[PDB]
Design a protein around this ligand. Structure first.
Ligand SMILES: CC(C)(COP(=O)(O)OP(=O)(O)OC[C@H]1O[C@@H](n2cnc3c(N)ncnc32)[C@H](O)[C@@H]1OP(=O)(O)O)[C@@H](O)C(=O)NCCC(=O)NCCS
Length: 91
């Protein structure tokens, strides 16, 4: 499919194996989620895993009324230009 989980205390959604993850920094007293860096290791690259990590932070922020700061350059450069319908999520 696959599967991504929320590791809240590390502040990221990540692959269950902990190796792929998108990290954020919350701001504005819980109202904003700043997506600061995303990480997929090599061998796992080019298979959409990065859109999947972004797809995990966006479905989540979206279900809680939290807007996104797209700091990570993967977010406002590849992921968002390919997923415009996520753009109204932007703070
Ligand atoms: C990029 C990251 C989100 C992992 O992504 P991923 O699962 O490989 O993303 P995918 O490979 O499926 O994405 C492919 C797309 O991401 C984009 N991308 C790659 N690096 C990027 C960057 N630094 N910033 C923005 N977008 C980028 C490419 O434009 C590519 O589109 P193209 O080949 O398809 O037409 C991120 O979590 C990471 O840490 N990457 C490290 C990547 C790296 O070190 N590459 C070294 C290449 S020498």
């Amino acid at each position: 499919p696959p599967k991504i989980v929320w590791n809240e205390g590390k502040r990221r959604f990540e692959t269950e194996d902990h190796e792929a993850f998108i990290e954020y920094k919350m701001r504005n007293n819980g109202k904003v989620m700043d997506l600061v860096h995303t990480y997929v290791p090599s061998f796992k690259r080019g298979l959409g895993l990065a859109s999947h990590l972004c797809v995990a932070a966006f479905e989540h922020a979206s279900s809680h009324s939290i807007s996104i700061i797209p700091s990570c350059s993967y977010v406002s450069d590849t992921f968002l230009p390919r997923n415009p319908s996520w753009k109204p999520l932007i703070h």
